Amino acid sequence: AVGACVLCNSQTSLRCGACIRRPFLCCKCCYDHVISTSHKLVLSVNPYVCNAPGCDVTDVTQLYLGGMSYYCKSHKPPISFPLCANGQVFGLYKNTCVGSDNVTDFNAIATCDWTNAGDYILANTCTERLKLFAAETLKATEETFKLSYGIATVREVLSDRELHLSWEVGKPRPPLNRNYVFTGYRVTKNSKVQIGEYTFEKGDYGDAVVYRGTTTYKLNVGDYFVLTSHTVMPLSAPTLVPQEHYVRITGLYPTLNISDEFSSNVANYQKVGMQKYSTLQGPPGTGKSHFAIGLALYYPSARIVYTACSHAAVDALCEKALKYLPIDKCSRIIPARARVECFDKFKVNSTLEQYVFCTVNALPETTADIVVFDEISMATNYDLSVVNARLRAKHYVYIGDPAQLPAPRTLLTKGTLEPEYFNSVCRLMKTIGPDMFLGTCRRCPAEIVDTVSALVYDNKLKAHKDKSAQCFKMFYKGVITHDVSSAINRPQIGVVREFLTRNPAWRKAVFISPYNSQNAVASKILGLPTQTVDSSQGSEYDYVIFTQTTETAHSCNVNRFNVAITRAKVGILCIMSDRDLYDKLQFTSL
Amino acid sequence: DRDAAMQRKLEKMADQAMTQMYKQARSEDKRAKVTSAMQTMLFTMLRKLDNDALNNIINNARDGCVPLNIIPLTTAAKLMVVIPDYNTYKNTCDGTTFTYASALWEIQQVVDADSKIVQLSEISMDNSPNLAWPLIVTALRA
Amino acid sequence: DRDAAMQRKLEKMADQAMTQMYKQARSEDKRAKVTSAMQTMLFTMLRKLDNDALNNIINNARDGCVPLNIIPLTTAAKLMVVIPDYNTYKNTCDGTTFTYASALWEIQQVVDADSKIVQLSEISMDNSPNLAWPLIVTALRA
Amino acid sequence: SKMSDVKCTSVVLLSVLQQLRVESSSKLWAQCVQLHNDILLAKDTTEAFEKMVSLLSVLLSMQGAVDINKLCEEM
Amino acid sequence: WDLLKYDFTEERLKLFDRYFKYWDQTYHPNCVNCLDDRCILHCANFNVLFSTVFPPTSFGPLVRKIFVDGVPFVVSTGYHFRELGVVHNQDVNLHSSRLSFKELLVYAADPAMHAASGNLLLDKRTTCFSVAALTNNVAFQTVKPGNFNKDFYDFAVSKGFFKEGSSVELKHFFFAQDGNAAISDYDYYRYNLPTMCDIRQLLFVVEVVDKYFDCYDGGCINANQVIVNNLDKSAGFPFNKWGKARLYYDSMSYEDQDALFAYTKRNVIPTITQMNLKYAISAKNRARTVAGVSICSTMTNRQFHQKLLKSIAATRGATVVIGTSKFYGGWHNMLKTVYSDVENPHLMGWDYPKCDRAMPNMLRIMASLVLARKHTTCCSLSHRFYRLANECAQVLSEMVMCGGSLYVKPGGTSSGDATTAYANSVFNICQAVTANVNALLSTDGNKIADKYVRNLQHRLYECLYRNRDVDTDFVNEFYAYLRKHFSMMILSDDAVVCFNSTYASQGLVASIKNFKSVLYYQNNVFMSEAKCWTETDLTKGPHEFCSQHTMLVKQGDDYVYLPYPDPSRILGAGCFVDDIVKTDGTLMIERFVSLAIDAYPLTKHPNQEYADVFHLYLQYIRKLHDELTGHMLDMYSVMLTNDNTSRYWEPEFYEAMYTPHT
Ligand SMILES: Nc1ncnc2c1ncn2[C@@H]1O[C@H](COP(=O)(O)OP(=O)(O)O)[C@@H](O)[C@H]1O
Ligand SMILES: [Mg+2]
Numbered sequence A: 001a002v003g004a005c006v007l008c009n010s011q012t013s014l015r016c017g018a019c020i021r022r023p024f025l026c027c028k029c030c031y032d033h034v035i036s037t038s039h040k041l042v043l044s045v046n047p048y049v050c051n052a053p054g055c056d057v058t059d060v061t062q063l064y065l066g067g068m069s070y071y072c073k074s075h076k077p078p079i080s081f082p083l084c085a086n087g088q089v090f091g092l093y094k095n096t097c098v099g100s101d102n103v104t105d106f107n108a109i110a111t112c113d114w115t116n117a118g119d120y121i122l123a124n125t126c127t128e129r130l131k132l133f134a135a136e137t138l139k140a141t142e143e144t145f146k147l148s149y150g151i152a153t154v155r156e157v158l159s160d161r162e163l164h165l166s167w168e169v170g171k172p173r174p175p176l177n178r179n180y181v182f183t184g185y186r187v188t189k190n191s192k193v194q195i196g197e198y199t200f201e202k203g204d205y206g207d208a209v210v211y212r213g214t215t216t217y218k219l220n221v222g223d224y225f226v227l228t229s230h231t232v233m234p235l236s237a238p239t240l241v242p243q244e245h246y247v248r249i250t251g252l253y254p255t256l257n258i259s260d261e262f263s264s265n266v267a268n269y270q271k272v273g274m275q276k277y278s279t280l281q282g283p284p285g286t287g288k289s290h291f292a293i294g295l296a297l298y299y300p301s302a303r304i305v306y307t308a309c310s311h312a313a314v315d316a317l318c319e320k321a322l323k324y325l326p327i328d329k330c331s332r333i334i335p336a337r338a339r340v341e342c343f344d345k346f347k348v349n350s351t352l353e354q355y356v357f358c359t360v361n362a363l364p365e366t367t368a369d370i371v372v373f374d375e376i377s378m379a380t381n382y383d384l385s386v387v388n389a390r391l392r393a394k395h396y397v398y399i400g401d402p403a404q405l406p407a408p409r410t411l412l413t414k415g416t417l418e419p420e421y422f423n424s425v426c427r428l429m430k431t432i433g434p435d436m437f438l439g440t441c442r443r444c445p446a447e448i449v450d451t452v453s454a455l456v457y458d459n460k461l462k463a464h465k466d467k468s469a470q471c472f473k474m475f476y477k478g479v480i481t482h483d484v485s486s487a488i489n490r491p492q493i494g495v496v497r498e499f500l501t502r503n504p505a506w507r508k509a510v511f512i513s514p515y516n517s518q519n520a521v522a523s524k525i526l527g528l529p530t531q532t533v534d535s536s537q538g539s540e541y542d543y544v545i546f547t548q549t550t551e552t553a554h555s556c557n558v559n560r561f562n563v564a565i566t567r568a569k570v571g572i573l574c575i576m577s578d579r580d581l582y583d584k585l586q587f588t589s590l
Numbered sequence B, C: 001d002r003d004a005a006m007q008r009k010l011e012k013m014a015d016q017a018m019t020q021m022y023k024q025a026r027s028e029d030k031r032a033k034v035t036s037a038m039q040t041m042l043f044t045m046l047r048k049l050d051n052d053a054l055n056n057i058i059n060n061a062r063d064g065c066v067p068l069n070i071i072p073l074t075t076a077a078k079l080m081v082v083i084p085d086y087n088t089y090k091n092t093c094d095g096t097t098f099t100y101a102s103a104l105w106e107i108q109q110v111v112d113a114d115s116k117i118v119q120l121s122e123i124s125m126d127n128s129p130n131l132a133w134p135l136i137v138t139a140l141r142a
Numbered sequence D: 001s002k003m004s005d006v007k008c009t010s011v012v013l014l015s016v017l018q019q020l021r022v023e024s025s026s027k028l029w030a031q032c033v034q035l036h037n038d039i040l041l042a043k044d045t046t047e048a049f050e051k052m053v054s055l056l057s058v059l060l061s062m063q064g065a066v067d068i069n070k071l072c073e074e075m
Numbered sequence E: 001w002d003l004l005k006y007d008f009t010e011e012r013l014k015l016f017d018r019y020f021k022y023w024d025q026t027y028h029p030n031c032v033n034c035l036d037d038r039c040i041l042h043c044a045n046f047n048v049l050f051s052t053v054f055p056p057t058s059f060g061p062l063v064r065k066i067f068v069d070g071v072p073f074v075v076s077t078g079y080h081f082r083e084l085g086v087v088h089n090q091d092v093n094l095h096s097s098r099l100s101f102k103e104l105l106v107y108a109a110d111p112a113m114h115a116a117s118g119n120l121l122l123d124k125r126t127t128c129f130s131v132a133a134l135t136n137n138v139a140f141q142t143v144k145p146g147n148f149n150k151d152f153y154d155f156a157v158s159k160g161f162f163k164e165g166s167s168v169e170l171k172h173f174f175f176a177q178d179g180n181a182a183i184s185d186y187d188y189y190r191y192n193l194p195t196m197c198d199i200r201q202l203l204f205v206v207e208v209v210d211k212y213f214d215c216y217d218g219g220c221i222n223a224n225q226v227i228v229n230n231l232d233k234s235a236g237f238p239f240n241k242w243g244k245a246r247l248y249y250d251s252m253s254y255e256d257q258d259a260l261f262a263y264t265k266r267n268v269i270p271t272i273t274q275m276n277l278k279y280a281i282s283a284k285n286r287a288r289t290v291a292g293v294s295i296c297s298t299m300t301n302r303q304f305h306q307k308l309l310k311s312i313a314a315t316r317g318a319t320v321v322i323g324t325s326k327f328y329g330g331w332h333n334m335l336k337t338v339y340s341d342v343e344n345p346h347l348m349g350w351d352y353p354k355c356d357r358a359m360p361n362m363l364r365i366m367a368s369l370v371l372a373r374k375h376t377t378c379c380s381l382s383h384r385f386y387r388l389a390n391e392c393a394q395v396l397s398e399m400v401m402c403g404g405s406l407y408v409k410p411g412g413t414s415s416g417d418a419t420t421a422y423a424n425s426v427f428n429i430c431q432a433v434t435a436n437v438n439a440l441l442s443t444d445g446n447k448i449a450d451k452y453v454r455n456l457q458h459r460l461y462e463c464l465y466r467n468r469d470v471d472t473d474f475v476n477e478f479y480a481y482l483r484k485h486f487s488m489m490i491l492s493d494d495a496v497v498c499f500n501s502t503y504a505s506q507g508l509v510a511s512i513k514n515f516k517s518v519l520y521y522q523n524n525v526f527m528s529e530a531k532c533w534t535e536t537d538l539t540k541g542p543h544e545f546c547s548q549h550t551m552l553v554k555q556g557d558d559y560v561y562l563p564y565p566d567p568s569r570i571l572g573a574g575c576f577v578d579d580i581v582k583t584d585g586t587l588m589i590e591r592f593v594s595l596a597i598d599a600y601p602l603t604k605h606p607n608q609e610y611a612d613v614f615h616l617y618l619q620y621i622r623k624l625h626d627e628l629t630g631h632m633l634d635m636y637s638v639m640l641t642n643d644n645t646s647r648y649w650e651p652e653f654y655e656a657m658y659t660p661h662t
């Protein structure tokens, strides 16, 4: 079991033991890491524990090598020599190793608990192998935080689709949505056995936890629930494959008389051909996700994989391809588990079609000829590393905007992450500028662009529309109730219910609220399609009913508000909560 | 001498452990990277030969001008090579002769990616954006 | 010295007897597994017989013995013809029915050497070069 | 050594073609094998180089199986 | 002919009374009635002729529907051999209860179930009769090329090898093969014709060959005395679907192997034998195939022949030099016992073209009847007949499985049975004695000046064509003549002969042209005289025997013969290896130690470019060990404490292998 040191890529055999990911480390770097922090456990081809019959000494500064085993200070044979000596912990390839100085950064990456604001800015301006290691340890920390959630136990079964749950005392309740799957148990005497993978949702009336299940078992009183935790796969591929400006287009053959719609995008298509990876940045609704379909129709012999981190972003791409691209030579990939329903009009799960569509986590190991990664703001360096490990291709086009809302980063609570730290590509668009840029709002009415080009994008947007007189925003305080952690606001659903009998054309509008639970609970009063702001990024709607639930730091986030209000194609109703933001936009009063 | 015998037995077992661990590590490493090592070895050997036909077909295959079948040896047999861009056409073709693999070939027929036949007078510095690349040239050995 | 070397010899011998007991258990388990595999092989080859024609020819022998070489030739239901080139194909099984072993066979499939299905409209004198010979034509007894 | 570098490059080149699963296409593997065995039993360097061109052109014929612009870059 | 008619005894008797009517010796159409192993050669030699007028589908096993606990099997209860006539089993159980391990082994080995439950096949790729096709699709098996060992090749051209006009050049490569190799190589059994042999002459050449095999001893041995060399060697078909031969030598306790072996002395077990394509370095691009014979045949043949076959390999000084090493002065001693006081020696060496495919069935039956003359006491007569029928059903004319399809092998030895180098040696001695008999009889007789030899020609004709009983006085006298003037040395088909040259010039002993004639009428191949050498000068030794040339060097204080290989072979074993991990070098220093042990005598060769091959291997072992300790000092920081590889690059460790002390 030999490997490569993370921060100098020398050959080595050690692995730090207190770090969650066990990064391979060369000898000098391992001494630097175990002499400064408190990570004192090291594993070679065998661990560095004391091989006494009974002894617990693991601190590598203490152990000695004797015979063919490592003994502590009080069991060493007189033919022995210290490991942690001379500035080098002894491992294989000891004298062919190059020291480094980044051990003042690798310590901070491997030591921190990822809660402060600075750890993400350090996980994104380091070297590439440290970017991969930092992303991997962040994924591992987010996974082992899920073990800190409570444990459920059934009190009674009110109905076959209505359980009743009591949570463990002193441990926080998990949020109840289809992200978090639980496993059942009947552990009494008598069968400490999993009885199915379930998932919950808080039913409207009573303390009923309406559960969906894989199996068809009857649930007793004693059945109890434990959250599942997914092991983090280690990652290898670089975040950004190195750029190589070509002289002339390779692998792509352009087209004769593409269309009259994508005629103004031809120069950017030639630029995509010339480079290796290119980055596109535009304010919302300005042709970014349209540009990818135009890339499809400008290089018709080019096999393309479209990818995004959500499912509604890739579904917006799927709809645009349904409108434009030929539907026989297209596809769509859905994972087997699939707690959420996806777009089903393409020949699902046929990766050999010329135009594949996928979420970045569920990609299959394949090739392409140009791969389009839409919505890079919602991507972490784990996601870009996964898309660089699976998909091997000739050109990469990263499309997205940093001013929309990022990956959530559940651990981050103290501070704010500027756009140039969201991942590597968003840093590239905020360091040197994007390779391709298109700002002109071709989707939203000019009222929406007039109020959204003053909040984030400082007066840089003009619309190919006019004031469409269907942009209403009202100010109603909305006395809130509290769910698990995602608040629910009854009286604002009430005023929306009033705005549904008294405006008939709007019954096709889509509900948008920053909280998942209110998005579930306003379907049973209204019946409209419902979408959360975080998962609404990239798909537009004819009419949008937005409801600011609470006055907080989350729902009064201007990026979240911007991606909320720039999805209405022709009409929007915005039930606000904050006074200043309600004064910041310029709608009708209502 | 009893203790020195114990030391000799221990160092002999250490020596066998070193040898067996090295053999296992090197053998599994060699059997892992077998595809890439063989391809790198092949192209090292191909550059070492310095033949003027192998160099020509490799320097064409870098640009994108690869043959679609096995290159023939017989006089007056058929070879179909794809030419991706006009400049690659200009480097290899002249009039109707076609200089490939250090041999002269007589062009018979140039088709497009839409499988329409094309005359060699359409292939111009100016009309080429109106073509449908990559051409497939069917030629015969001189 | 006597007792300690005695116990060292004793525990060496006991570990030897344990190792040979392990070896015997592994040998007997593998014998059981091979006997199961042979028995299931024989019983599947029993179920694959064609018992009508086989009973007819065995009951038509004057002793009950028939040579093995004519068990398939008069009771097999599938005939696989392997054909190396086109003249052989034209002479042995031209068309969709032919004759062999004094029966009439109907061609149910033709695959090539690559296990790809080849339609009967392909096998002609001018498309004979592009087929991956030999051709395996599977026919059924009519 | 010029004759006995083509006799060894045939060995390496046919090993590369076999690792790329040429031999699942029988009509192509028959010609690659025939070119290999003809190079190995050759006494004149000209015919060995022509058969080496024909054999290598099988490897360049398959587009994405190798990455020729990456392998030739290091030289 | 009736399709199911398998018993042609009356037709054979009608043919024999129509053509050979006044041939007075008895003819038993079924050889199971015969009286000794000289009435088996007689009646077998007749049935070789007659069985070419009978339909070819009527030979092979005779199946019969038996019942095991109520379920109907079809299993083989006999055989109908082309040479041996009809042979019936004696222990056939038409209603059996259960299947033990022995009965299960027998019913899975034999081809009655496999051919009876497969699709009919018509393979136009061959001419050999095709029985069935077990799978639904025939299998095309390729042979990959060998892996290049580029480090050694660059070391070799660094030392100045492989230049233009070199006397040492690569000719031994790893040749690859396309799909139809195994069935375009099995097709070489079309060179096997049914040859009737001259039976009044074969029944004398048998006695002289038996005199050549007189000093050894043999018999049946019990199953606990059987020594298997390597037990991880595959067990043929169908037993390789579940394990190696280790499994079937571990599953059957010695009672269950003795019971199987005592079963084959009263029963015939037909057996399927695979044809494996060989992957090894060679000089010519024809594919080479080896017949992997079933463990049900190899076990019993090992018990039957192992005592004789391990007493041939342990006798030094005989004609059959199998088991005499070329190391430690063994080659000198072999070459000195060839020259056992022949008068005016010339060495001669011949070459059978297609030795294992053209070899007739009668000479393979003679080889198996000479290897089984040692059982005068341990076996009865019918036991020896049923062992002959088991060899002819499992080895000679078996069902060959060639890529998912059962074909009928027409005849000639299969290179993988338990007695193949030795049965080949008996065939080789038989052809040399037949050449001498033809050369001595075909001489004029008035021109033979030596009154002893002319009387020997007269007595030889009389003992061939005028006696019916073996004349041990003259058989001993003619064998003494052959050893005095035609000394041989035999390794399975490589023969070196040290014949008297005045005699063979006068015509009283076989020259090359007599072997050309004998192989014409008794092997159906033409032995071209560009593969048979004649060395008139004994201080150069045999020009080639067992692929090693021989040279007379000065060693110690006296002159010895030493074997040296072909230098292209040793360099080809360096540069081209058949597994990827053998390319590494540093793991394989024992590979280069063995190659340098084989290439040591090239140092004493006078061509300097030959003598550099040994120093190339010594310098390569030194470089390999230097870079090995370099890497094992990097991986650790301590060199190996004890290291005795320092002697593999001194020439004394290698020169000690060719000095006669051990
Ligand atoms: N070249 C164009 N001319 C006119 N309208 C366009 C053009 N390109 C895109 N649009 C419109 O603008 C909208 C932009 O959609 P999309 O590409 O999804 O924006 P985003 O990528 O910001 O979500 C599309 O609905 C499309 O109808
Ligand atoms: Mg978009």
Ligand SMILES: [Zn+2]
Binding pocket: A016, A017, A018, A019, A033, A039, A110
């Ligand atoms: Zn650590």
Ligand SMILES: [Zn+2]
Binding pocket: A005, A006, A007, A008, A009, A010, A025, A026, A027, A028, A029, A030, A098, A099, A100
């Ligand atoms: Zn390091």
Ligand SMILES: [Zn+2]
Binding pocket: A050, A051, A052, A054, A055, A056, A057, A071, A072, A073, A074, A075
């Ligand atoms: Zn201790």
Ligand SMILES: [Zn+2]
Binding pocket: E026, E027, E028, E031, E033, E034, E035, E039, E040, E042, E043
């Ligand atoms: Zn007889």
Ligand SMILES: [Zn+2]
Binding pocket: E219, E220, E375, E378, E379
């Ligand atoms: Zn016996």
